[PDB]
Amino acid sequence: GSDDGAFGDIWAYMSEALTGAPGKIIACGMLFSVAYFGVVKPNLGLALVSALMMLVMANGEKIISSFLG
Amino acid sequence: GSDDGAFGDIWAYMSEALTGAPGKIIACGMLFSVAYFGVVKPNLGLALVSALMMLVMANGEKIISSFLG
Amino acid sequence: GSDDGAFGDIWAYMSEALTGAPGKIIACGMLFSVAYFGVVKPNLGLALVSALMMLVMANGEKIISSFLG
Amino acid sequence: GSDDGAFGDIWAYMSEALTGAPGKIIACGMLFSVAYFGVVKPNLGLALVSALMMLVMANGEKIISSFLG
Amino acid sequence: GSDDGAFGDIWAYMSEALTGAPGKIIACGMLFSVAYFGVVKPNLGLALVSALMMLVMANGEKIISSFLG
Amino acid sequence: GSDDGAFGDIWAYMSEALTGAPGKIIACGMLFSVAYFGVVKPNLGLALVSALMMLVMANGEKIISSFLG
Amino acid sequence: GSDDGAFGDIWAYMSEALTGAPGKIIACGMLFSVAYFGVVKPNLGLALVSALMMLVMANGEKIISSFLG
Amino acid sequence: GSDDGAFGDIWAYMSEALTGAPGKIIACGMLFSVAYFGVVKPNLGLALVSALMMLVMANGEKIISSFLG
Amino acid sequence: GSDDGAFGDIWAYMSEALTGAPGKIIACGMLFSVAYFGVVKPNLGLALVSALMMLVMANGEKIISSFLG
Amino acid sequence: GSDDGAFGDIWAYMSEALTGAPGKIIACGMLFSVAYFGVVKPNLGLALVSALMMLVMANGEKIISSFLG
Amino acid sequence: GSDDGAFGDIWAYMSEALTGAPGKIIACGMLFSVAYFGVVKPNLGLALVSALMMLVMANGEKIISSFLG
Amino acid sequence: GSDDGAFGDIWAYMSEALTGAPGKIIACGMLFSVAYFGVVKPNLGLALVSALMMLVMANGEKIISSFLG
Amino acid sequence: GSDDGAFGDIWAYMSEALTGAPGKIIACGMLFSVAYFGVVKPNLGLALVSALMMLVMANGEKIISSFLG
Amino acid sequence: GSDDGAFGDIWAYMSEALTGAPGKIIACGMLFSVAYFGVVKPNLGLALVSALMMLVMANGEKIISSFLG
Amino acid sequence: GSDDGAFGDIWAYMSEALTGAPGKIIACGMLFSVAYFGVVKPNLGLALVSALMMLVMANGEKIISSFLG
Amino acid sequence: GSDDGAFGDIWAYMSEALTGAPGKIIACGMLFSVAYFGVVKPNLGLALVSALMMLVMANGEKIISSFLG
Amino acid sequence: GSDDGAFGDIWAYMSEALTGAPGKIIACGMLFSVAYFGVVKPNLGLALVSALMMLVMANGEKIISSFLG
Amino acid sequence: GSDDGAFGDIWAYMSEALTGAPGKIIACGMLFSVAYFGVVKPNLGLALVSALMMLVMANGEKIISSFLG
Amino acid sequence: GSDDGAFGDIWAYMSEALTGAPGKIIACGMLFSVAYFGVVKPNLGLALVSALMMLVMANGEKIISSFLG
Amino acid sequence: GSDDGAFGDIWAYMSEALTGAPGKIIACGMLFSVAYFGVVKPNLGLALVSALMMLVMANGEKIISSFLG
Ligand SMILES: CCCCCCCCCCCCCCCC(=O)OC[C@H](COP(=O)(O)OC[C@@H](O)CO)OC(=O)CCCCCCCCCCCCCCC
Ligand SMILES: CCCCCCCCCCCCCCCC(=O)OC[C@H](COP(=O)(O)OC[C@@H](O)CO)OC(=O)CCCCCCCCCCCCCCC
Ligand SMILES: CCCCCCCCCCCCCCCC(=O)OC[C@H](COP(=O)(O)OC[C@@H](O)CO)OC(=O)CCCCCCCCCCCCCCC
Ligand SMILES: CCCCCCCCCCCCCCCC(=O)OC[C@H](COP(=O)(O)OC[C@@H](O)CO)OC(=O)CCCCCCCCCCCCCCC
Ligand SMILES: CCCCCCCCCCCCCCCC(=O)OC[C@H](COP(=O)(O)OC[C@@H](O)CO)OC(=O)CCCCCCCCCCCCCCC
Ligand SMILES: CCCCCCCCCCCCCCCC(=O)OC[C@H](COP(=O)(O)OC[C@@H](O)CO)OC(=O)CCCCCCCCCCCCCCC
Ligand SMILES: CCCCCCCCCCCCCCCC(=O)OC[C@H](COP(=O)(O)OC[C@@H](O)CO)OC(=O)CCCCCCCCCCCCCCC
Ligand SMILES: CCCCCCCCCCCCCCCC(=O)OC[C@H](COP(=O)(O)OC[C@@H](O)CO)OC(=O)CCCCCCCCCCCCCCC
Ligand SMILES: CCCCCCCCCCCCCCCC(=O)OC[C@H](COP(=O)(O)OC[C@@H](O)CO)OC(=O)CCCCCCCCCCCCCCC
Ligand SMILES: CCCCCCCCCCCCCCCC(=O)OC[C@H](COP(=O)(O)OC[C@@H](O)CO)OC(=O)CCCCCCCCCCCCCCC
Ligand SMILES: CCCCCCCCCCCCCCCC(=O)OC[C@H](COP(=O)(O)OC[C@@H](O)CO)OC(=O)CCCCCCCCCCCCCCC
Ligand SMILES: CCCCCCCCCCCCCCCC(=O)OC[C@H](COP(=O)(O)OC[C@@H](O)CO)OC(=O)CCCCCCCCCCCCCCC
Ligand SMILES: CCCCCCCCCCCCCCCC(=O)OC[C@H](COP(=O)(O)OC[C@@H](O)CO)OC(=O)CCCCCCCCCCCCCCC
């Protein structure tokens, strides 16, 4: 695929925001949810799941560029 | 089928955009939705489903050209 | 039925366009809709439905010629 | 009824065109509409309805000749 | 009523044409309209209505002769 | 009521067609719809409903003749 | 009211046809519509509504004669 | 009922297609849906339901001919 | 039933794809789901259920051809 | 079955990924879950279950190709 | 209220049919639905609910005559 | 208000029919609808609602005469 | 305003009929409509709306005389 | 109640089918469901519940005739 | 009850399949489940329960025919 | 509040029926449900809850009159 | 409360059936459940609970009449 | 606000009916619904909610007069 | 804006009626609707919404005068 | 209580089956369970408990008839 065109700026902004401020906000929300739901039932496995999800988010642009030429 | 004609340019643009900027934008939206919905209920299977959907998108032009001569 | 006559050219163009550029454009639109609606609710069954619809489109001329003599 | 007379040629042309080029054009339009409306809401039942309508078109001359002597 | 007189030939021609070539042409037009309007909104009930109308046309002479002595 | 008159032939044809070819076509359409809608959500109760509807169709002439003298 | 006069024959024919051949034809049309619309959405309540309507038709002459002296 | 008439060919085609190519296509769609929905929640009871539905389809013509004379 | 006709090609493609590439893709999805859901709760019985479902898929064409003549 | 066709690339990618990077990621997740759940209740049998599941994953393509021709 | 008048026959027929053939048909449909829905989830309480509904139907005329003078 | 005048007879007939034959027919229709809709989803609360509606019908004349002097 | 003049009698008759026989007839029609539409969908809120409308009708003359001097 | 009338044949067919072929089919479906759901969780109490339901089905006509006069 | 009618073939097939191939498949599934669940917790009582369930399946047709006349 | 007015009769009937025949019917239904649901899971606490609910029903009119002046 | 009225017959039937045939059927079901669940875990206390529940059923009418005047 | 004017009588009637006969009827309906829905699922919290709603109804006029001057 | 002019009286009446008799009538209707819809589904949040709406109505004149000079 | 009525046959069958074939089957299951669970831990007290349970089953009809009049 080609990253340029009429929608090149939108794709660039989305890719930068995936690991940028919106992605960091979503990760912080994940951490907040993990901490909050652990008040009654402490479960640190959800922290590992959130870490894996943040790892996927960090590699989301690479996966998208690999699958879509 | 024949890729040329009066609508050849439209079909060419659509095929290139399927794996181009609009397709990448839709894939990034899929990743964003997967990350967002995992704040409360972490589910990494939806990431696999999104990967399969991006794989289908990458092969969409081939499928269309195979089915429609 | 007879494929010739005053409307022979129109019927020929429609039959060729069913599996030609307009049909391919409609199939690409189907794929785009399937990818877009899967952002929030990933459902790969709609991809199978779209594949079946493209299969019907590929055989549309044969069905029409079989039913209408 | 009698197929001859002053309007025999018009009736003959209409009967031949029902399963001829105009009928095939209308059937192709039915297929195109079914494919187009399935982009957002894939519904293959309309394909069955269109097949039944083409079956009725193929037997339209027989029905007309049976009802009208 | 009496079928003879100065207008006997006109009445005879009209009665024969009701189920003859003009009636068959009108029935074929009904079928064409049913097929055409079903491209966007497939509705096979109109086919049943057209069949009933052709049944009425086939019995039009009998009804007229029964009502008018 | 009286089954004869100017509209006796139309009523006779309608009564015979209720359990005849058009009624059988409608019943086959009911079966096709039941089979088609069961692809995604298998529901055999609709088959029982269709059987009851065909039973009503078989007794439609008797009901009409009983209600209308 | 008085059933005789200049329009006595017309009123007599209408009253006899209400439960006669035209009324039976309308009832058969009701049954056909109920069967046809039940192909996609089986609803046997419309059959009960049609039965009530035929019951009203059977008593239409009595109602008219009661209201109009 | 009588299988002949103006709509005899349509009824014959529908009856043959119920257990013919369209019926087989619908059954294959049932099998595909059963296999697809079993990816996340394996449920082999739906396979039994589909088998019963195909059994009903195989006997649909017999049921219709029994109910409608 | 008869495998030929206007829909013979569609039925042939569906039957070949049931045990072909789409069926293999669905089976691989079944295996992926079984492996993924076993991360937290290892359950190898779902593997046996998936094997039985693939066995049913392999015999789907035979079952359909046996039930539908 | 045939591994080629319109969906040949998708099936090839899925088969290679079953024992490739996604399969290895799922196996590593299995190991992580086994290690994590053993903090409070050490149970090494789940390690054997995970080893068996990885063995099934390694032979998943062979099983699918054997069952689906 | 008064049971006579222009609509006396309609009311009499409705009251007799409430506990007559149509009411018995509706009760048999209730029993059939209770038996059918108990295939997957056996629930005999719905049988008691249906018995209570039939009891209400048996006393429907009395209730209507008591409320409406 | 005054119950006499040019429209005194119409008002008297309407008031008597509210709790008379037409009102009883409407109440019987309510009972029939309650029984029919309870075939699939037994709900006896609708019977209580219908009883309340019949109670309102029985007191409709009193309410109208109280509000309108 | 002044209630006398050339149109004093018409205004007096209209004001008396608002809460007189025609108003009572309209209120009875409201009650009949509420009872009839509640056969399929029992909704007693429409009864409250009708009561409010009758309350407005009872005070219509006062409102008109207050607004128009 | 009276078993005769316009709907006497429908009621007779329903009563005979309650303990006839459709009732036996529903009972066989109950047995199949009991056997199938006992693969993972063997529960023979559901067999007793199904036996009680078949006992109710055998006495359904008697119950309906007792409740509805 | 009567084993013949429109649904005689369906009932015959279901009765033969209860102790035929589908019943044997369900029994083999019962045995497989008993063997599989005994890997961690060996319990041979479930084998006796499965034997009793197969005994019930073998006598299912007799029970159904005894309860339903 | 005032118990008289246009709706005095409706309120009186509702208050008398709360502890009258409809209230007793609802209480008997409560007892029947308690007995029925205790077949599998005997729970006599629901009997105490039903007794408390009947106590509330007996005092419903007093509560309503106390809250609403 | 008053046992008479429009719902007097329904209340009488429910009260008689509480200790009549339906109540005896529910008690027999309780005994059957107690015997069945005692195959694996013999517990005769559930028999005492069922006896107490039958005692409550025998006094249900008295309790309802005492609470509801 | 001012309670007088052209709509003073309507407002006075509505305020008196809020805690009068219509309000008492609505409260009795609330109690009936609470008792009815507690047959299957006894929930006395809905009684407390209904008591709070009646408390709000008793103070509705005060709230309206406080908010609207 | 200026409150005087040709339409000063109309604006004054509307502003006074917003918090006057018509506004109070609308608020009482809101309370009645909240009480009525809470019979089946008790929801006291709608009471808070109605209170907020009455608060907006009380400040409607101030908002209008602030926005429109 | 009365043993007759609409449910007299069901109650008679249940009472006869309590000490009949189903009761004997349940008792044999009790004996089989006692023998099976005694392989590892021989406990003949469970045999006495089963004997007491069979004694209760033999007197179940008497207890039910004594408690329920
Ligand atoms: C960075 C450090 C390493 C990362 C952490 C290690 C992995 C941790 C996972 C196991 C923790 C176990 C205790 C969890 C506690 C727990 O209850 O988890 C709950 C969570 C949800 O799982 P299910 O939906 O199966 O849960 C159903 C219920 O059990 C609800 O919990 O489990 C997972 O997410 C497991 C899947 C992660 C493993 C699968 C990963 C492979 C799929 C993704 C591959 C990439 C796809 C890319 C797409 C673009
Ligand atoms: C690239 C790496 C390999 C790809 C990933 C591996 C496959 C992953 C699938 C299983 C993950 C299981 C956990 C998911 C978590 C989950 O809940 O998923 C939810 C998602 C939606 O499934 P349903 O609509 O059945 O879900 C109903 C509810 O369960 C909602 O979840 O499941 C799927 O998409 C399964 C279908 C994928 C498998 C079918 C693929 C074959 C059809 C497409 C073939 C191509 C068609 C082409 C048309 C042109
Ligand atoms: C090429 C590979 C093989 C093709 C793919 C295999 C078939 C896939 C179908 C099942 C996927 C199930 C999951 C879908 C997910 C899903 O939700 O689907 C939604 C889609 C719409 O179905 P309904 O309108 O019943 O849906 C109502 C709601 O459920 C909305 O989804 O379902 C279908 O299209 C089923 C009908 C396809 C099967 C019928 C085919 C036979 C009719 C056409 C025969 C030809 C007519 C020719 C006329 C000229
Ligand atoms: C050649 C292969 C066999 C043909 C295909 C099998 C029949 C397919 C019908 C059912 C598919 C169900 C899913 C459809 C999906 C669907 O939504 O359909 C929509 C379409 C329109 O129906 P309605 O107007 O009832 O729909 C109202 C809304 O539901 C809009 O859909 O339904 C039909 O056409 C049903 C009538 C066909 C059955 C009636 C046929 C008998 C009348 C014609 C007899 C001949 C008259 C001759 C006059 C000369
Ligand atoms: C021949 C064998 C015996 C016939 C089959 C047995 C009856 C089967 C009915 C119950 C199956 C339950 C599962 C269905 C699955 C289901 O969902 O059904 C859907 C279908 C539509 O019902 P509703 O419109 O209430 O459904 C609203 C939604 O639930 C949509 O399903 O239900 C019925 O048709 C029930 C009415 C049949 C019973 C009423 C019959 C009495 C009225 C007709 C009397 C004759 C009138 C003659 C007029 C001339
Ligand atoms: C050929 C081999 C023998 C056939 C297979 C044996 C029967 C299998 C049924 C039980 C499997 C249980 C596990 C299923 C898993 C399951 O969840 O099923 C789901 C499916 C839908 O049932 P419901 O709509 O009750 O489900 C509501 C939810 O539970 C959704 O599942 O259940 C049925 O279809 C049961 C009805 C079949 C039995 C009724 C048959 C009698 C009616 C048809 C008679 C012919 C009518 C002819 C009209 C022309
Ligand atoms: C190729 C090797 C042999 C195949 C594997 C052996 C059979 C394995 C089954 C037992 C494993 C037990 C542990 C599973 C672990 C487990 O939890 O399973 C879950 C799965 C779903 O069962 P249910 O829906 O009863 O589960 C409800 C909950 O328990 C969810 O698990 O169980 C089955 O699929 C049992 C039915 C298979 C047996 C029925 C087969 C007969 C019906 C199909 C016959 C063909 C129909 C053809 C239609 C065209
Ligand atoms: C003749 C023998 C005696 C009759 C049977 C005894 C009563 C049986 C009721 C309890 C069985 C409990 C297990 C059911 C299993 C069950 O799930 O039931 C479902 C059914 C529907 O109830 P809901 O709509 O509350 O259910 C919501 C969900 O739970 C869906 O089930 O429950 C009822 O019908 C209870 C109301 C009957 C009791 C109210 C009767 C009083 C109102 C009618 C009075 C006459 C009005 C006349 C108007 C003209
Ligand atoms: C004679 C015996 C005593 C009468 C029966 C007792 C009252 C029964 C009501 C509750 C049953 C609850 C279960 C129902 C089951 C149910 O689903 O009901 C459905 C039905 C419709 O309510 P909605 O439109 O709120 O329903 C929306 C959806 O929930 C559809 O059900 O509910 C009502 O009618 C409640 C209103 C009756 C209570 C309001 C009465 C006060 C207004 C009328 C006052 C007179 C106006 C006179 C104007 C002239
Ligand atoms: C012919 C031989 C004698 C028949 C068998 C003996 C009765 C067997 C019942 C107990 C078995 C216990 C183990 C079951 C295993 C089990 O889990 O059962 C499940 C099944 C469903 O009960 P529930 O809906 O209470 O279950 C909620 C969950 O526990 C799901 O199981 O239980 C019943 O059906 C009990 C009701 C039968 C007893 C009530 C009968 C009286 C009502 C019907 C009277 C006739 C109404 C006629 C209307 C026309
Ligand atoms: C006449 C003799 C004395 C009456 C009986 C004594 C009270 C019995 C309650 C405890 C029995 C415990 C075992 C039950 C077994 C049981 O499972 O109960 C189930 C039932 C439902 O409770 P929940 O909805 O909390 O249950 C959620 C799940 O646990 C389902 O059971 O519990 C209650 O009803 C408790 C509330 C009664 C106590 C609250 C009463 C105060 C509120 C009503 C005050 C009047 C409001 C008037 C409005 C107009
Ligand atoms: C007179 C005696 C004292 C009154 C009773 C005490 C309060 C009872 C409430 C708690 C009972 C809990 C168990 C209920 C059982 C239950 O399930 O309730 C269901 C009912 C509906 O609540 P939701 O819509 O949140 O429920 C969603 C689902 O849970 C459906 O239940 O809950 C309430 O109404 C709670 C709100 C009452 C508390 C809020 C009051 C403040 C708002 C109103 C203030 C006045 C507004 C005036 C506007 C003009
Ligand atoms: C006087 C005492 C304090 C007032 C009450 C406190 C506020 C109560 C609101 C929350 C209650 C939540 C439970 C409700 C239960 C509920 O279901 O509510 C339903 C109602 C309708 O909301 P939607 O249309 O979002 O609902 C869609 C569905 O959920 C239908 O309910 O919700 C609201 O009105 C929320 C908006 C109020 C909050 C927005 C206020 C700000 C906008 C107005 C500002 C002034 C505009 C002036 C223009 C001139």
Short mmCIF file of N, CA and C in Angstrom, two decimals, chain A residues 1-4 6-8 10-11 14-15 17-18 22-23 26 29-30 33 37 46 49 52-53 56-57 60 63-65 67-69, chain B residues 13 16 18-29 31-32 34-36 38-44 47 51-52 54-55 57-58:
data_model
loop_
_atom_site.label_atom_id
_atom_site.label_comp_id
_atom_site.label_asym_id
_atom_site.label_seq_id
_atom_site.Cartn_x
_atom_site.Cartn_y
_atom_site.Cartn_z
N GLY A 1 0.80 -1.21 0.00
CA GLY A 1 0.00 0.00 0.00
C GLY A 1 0.83 1.27 0.00
N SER A 2 0.18 2.40 -0.23
CA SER A 2 0.84 3.70 -0.26
C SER A 2 0.31 4.55 0.88
N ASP A 3 1.22 5.15 1.65
CA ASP A 3 0.84 6.00 2.77
C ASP A 3 0.45 7.41 2.36
N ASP A 4 0.63 7.77 1.09
CA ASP A 4 0.33 9.10 0.61
C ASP A 4 -1.06 9.14 -0.02
N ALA A 6 -4.89 11.49 -0.74
CA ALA A 6 -5.79 12.45 -0.10
C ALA A 6 -5.92 12.19 1.40
N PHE A 7 -5.85 10.92 1.81
CA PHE A 7 -5.99 10.54 3.21
C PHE A 7 -4.65 10.26 3.87
N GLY A 8 -3.56 10.75 3.29
CA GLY A 8 -2.25 10.53 3.89
C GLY A 8 -2.10 11.21 5.24
N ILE A 10 -4.50 12.03 7.39
CA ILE A 10 -5.34 11.36 8.39
C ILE A 10 -4.66 10.09 8.88
N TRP A 11 -4.12 9.30 7.95
CA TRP A 11 -3.44 8.07 8.34
C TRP A 11 -2.20 8.37 9.17
N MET A 14 -3.36 9.31 12.66
CA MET A 14 -3.84 8.14 13.39
C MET A 14 -2.68 7.26 13.84
N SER A 15 -1.70 7.03 12.96
CA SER A 15 -0.56 6.20 13.33
C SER A 15 0.25 6.83 14.44
N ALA A 17 -0.88 8.97 16.69
CA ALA A 17 -1.70 9.00 17.90
C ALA A 17 -1.89 7.62 18.52
N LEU A 18 -1.70 6.55 17.74
CA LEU A 18 -1.82 5.21 18.31
C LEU A 18 -0.81 5.00 19.43
N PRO A 22 -3.35 10.00 22.56
CA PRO A 22 -4.55 9.17 22.78
C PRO A 22 -4.25 7.74 23.20
N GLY A 23 -3.21 7.13 22.62
CA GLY A 23 -2.84 5.79 23.04
C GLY A 23 -2.37 5.75 24.48
N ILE A 26 -5.43 5.95 26.66
CA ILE A 26 -6.12 4.67 26.75
C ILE A 26 -5.36 3.70 27.65
N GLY A 29 -6.01 4.68 31.15
CA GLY A 29 -7.33 4.20 31.51
C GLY A 29 -7.34 2.71 31.82
N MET A 30 -6.57 1.93 31.06
CA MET A 30 -6.42 0.51 31.36
C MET A 30 -5.83 0.30 32.75
N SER A 33 -8.44 1.21 35.39
CA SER A 33 -9.44 0.16 35.52
C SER A 33 -8.89 -1.05 36.26
N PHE A 37 -10.74 -2.18 39.72
CA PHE A 37 -11.38 -3.48 39.86
C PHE A 37 -10.66 -4.40 40.82
N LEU A 46 -4.73 -9.23 35.24
CA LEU A 46 -5.24 -8.20 34.35
C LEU A 46 -4.18 -7.15 34.05
N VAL A 49 -2.32 -8.64 31.24
CA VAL A 49 -3.12 -8.52 30.02
C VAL A 49 -3.04 -7.10 29.47
N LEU A 52 0.29 -6.60 27.81
CA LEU A 52 0.27 -7.20 26.48
C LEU A 52 -0.51 -6.34 25.49
N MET A 53 -1.62 -5.75 25.94
CA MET A 53 -2.40 -4.88 25.06
C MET A 53 -1.62 -3.63 24.68
N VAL A 56 0.80 -4.63 22.06
CA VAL A 56 0.13 -4.71 20.77
C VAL A 56 -0.09 -3.31 20.19
N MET A 57 -0.48 -2.36 21.03
CA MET A 57 -0.66 -0.98 20.58
C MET A 57 0.64 -0.39 20.05
N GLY A 60 1.10 -1.74 16.64
CA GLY A 60 -0.06 -1.71 15.77
C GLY A 60 0.25 -1.17 14.39
N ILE A 63 2.09 -3.80 12.36
CA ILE A 63 1.19 -4.86 11.91
C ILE A 63 0.34 -4.38 10.75
N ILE A 64 -0.21 -3.17 10.86
CA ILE A 64 -1.07 -2.64 9.80
C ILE A 64 -0.28 -2.47 8.51
N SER A 65 0.94 -1.94 8.60
CA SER A 65 1.75 -1.74 7.41
C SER A 65 2.21 -3.06 6.81
N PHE A 67 0.42 -6.04 6.99
CA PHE A 67 -0.73 -6.70 6.38
C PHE A 67 -1.20 -5.95 5.14
N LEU A 68 -1.34 -4.63 5.24
CA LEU A 68 -1.78 -3.80 4.12
C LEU A 68 -0.56 -3.20 3.45
N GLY A 69 -0.28 -3.64 2.23
CA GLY A 69 0.88 -3.18 1.49
C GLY A 69 0.89 -1.68 1.24
N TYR B 13 -8.80 3.08 -8.41
CA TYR B 13 -8.65 3.85 -7.18
C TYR B 13 -9.18 3.07 -5.98
N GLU B 16 -6.70 0.24 -5.11
CA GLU B 16 -5.49 0.75 -4.47
C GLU B 16 -5.77 1.28 -3.07
N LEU B 18 -8.09 0.14 -1.04
CA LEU B 18 -8.43 -0.95 -0.13
C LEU B 18 -7.23 -1.33 0.74
N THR B 19 -6.04 -1.40 0.16
CA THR B 19 -4.81 -1.63 0.90
C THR B 19 -3.98 -0.36 1.05
N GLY B 20 -4.54 0.79 0.71
CA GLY B 20 -3.85 2.07 0.75
C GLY B 20 -4.17 2.85 2.01
N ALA B 21 -4.28 4.17 1.85
CA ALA B 21 -4.54 5.04 3.00
C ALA B 21 -5.89 4.78 3.66
N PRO B 22 -7.02 4.70 2.94
CA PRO B 22 -8.29 4.43 3.64
C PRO B 22 -8.31 3.08 4.34
N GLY B 23 -7.75 2.04 3.72
CA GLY B 23 -7.69 0.75 4.38
C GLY B 23 -6.83 0.78 5.63
N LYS B 24 -5.70 1.48 5.57
CA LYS B 24 -4.86 1.63 6.75
C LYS B 24 -5.57 2.41 7.84
N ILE B 25 -6.36 3.42 7.46
CA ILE B 25 -7.12 4.19 8.44
C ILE B 25 -8.16 3.30 9.12
N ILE B 26 -8.84 2.46 8.34
CA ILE B 26 -9.83 1.55 8.92
C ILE B 26 -9.15 0.54 9.84
N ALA B 27 -7.97 0.04 9.45
CA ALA B 27 -7.24 -0.89 10.32
C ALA B 27 -6.81 -0.21 11.61
N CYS B 28 -6.35 1.04 11.53
CA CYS B 28 -5.98 1.77 12.73
C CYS B 28 -7.19 2.01 13.62
N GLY B 29 -8.35 2.26 13.01
CA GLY B 29 -9.58 2.37 13.78
C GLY B 29 -9.93 1.06 14.47
N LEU B 31 -7.74 -1.18 15.48
CA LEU B 31 -6.81 -1.29 16.61
C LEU B 31 -7.22 -0.37 17.75
N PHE B 32 -7.64 0.85 17.43
CA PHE B 32 -8.08 1.78 18.47
C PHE B 32 -9.31 1.26 19.20
N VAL B 34 -10.18 -1.91 19.52
CA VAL B 34 -9.75 -3.06 20.32
C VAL B 34 -9.09 -2.59 21.61
N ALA B 35 -8.23 -1.57 21.52
CA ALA B 35 -7.58 -1.05 22.72
C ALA B 35 -8.58 -0.39 23.65
N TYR B 36 -9.55 0.34 23.10
CA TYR B 36 -10.50 1.08 23.93
C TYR B 36 -11.45 0.14 24.66
N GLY B 38 -10.95 -2.79 25.55
CA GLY B 38 -10.21 -3.59 26.49
C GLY B 38 -9.89 -2.91 27.80
N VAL B 39 -10.35 -1.67 27.99
CA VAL B 39 -10.10 -0.96 29.24
C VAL B 39 -10.87 -1.63 30.38
N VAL B 40 -12.14 -1.95 30.15
CA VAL B 40 -12.97 -2.56 31.18
C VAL B 40 -12.90 -4.08 31.12
N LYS B 41 -12.96 -4.66 29.92
CA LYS B 41 -12.93 -6.10 29.72
C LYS B 41 -11.79 -6.44 28.77
N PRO B 42 -10.58 -6.68 29.29
CA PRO B 42 -9.45 -7.01 28.41
C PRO B 42 -9.69 -8.32 27.67
N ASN B 43 -9.75 -8.22 26.34
CA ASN B 43 -10.01 -9.37 25.48
C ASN B 43 -9.08 -9.26 24.27
N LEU B 44 -8.02 -10.06 24.26
CA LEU B 44 -7.05 -10.03 23.16
C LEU B 44 -7.49 -10.86 21.97
N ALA B 47 -8.20 -8.72 19.03
CA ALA B 47 -7.01 -8.37 18.26
C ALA B 47 -6.74 -9.39 17.16
N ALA B 51 -6.76 -8.80 13.18
CA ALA B 51 -5.67 -9.23 12.31
C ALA B 51 -6.20 -10.04 11.14
N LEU B 52 -7.15 -10.94 11.40
CA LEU B 52 -7.77 -11.70 10.32
C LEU B 52 -8.52 -10.79 9.36
N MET B 54 -7.81 -7.62 8.70
CA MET B 54 -6.79 -6.95 7.89
C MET B 54 -6.19 -7.89 6.85
N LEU B 55 -6.04 -9.17 7.19
CA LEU B 55 -5.60 -10.16 6.21
C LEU B 55 -6.60 -10.29 5.07
N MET B 57 -8.67 -7.91 4.12
CA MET B 57 -8.56 -6.66 3.37
C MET B 57 -7.38 -6.69 2.42
N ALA B 58 -6.24 -7.24 2.86
CA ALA B 58 -5.07 -7.31 2.00
C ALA B 58 -5.32 -8.19 0.78
#
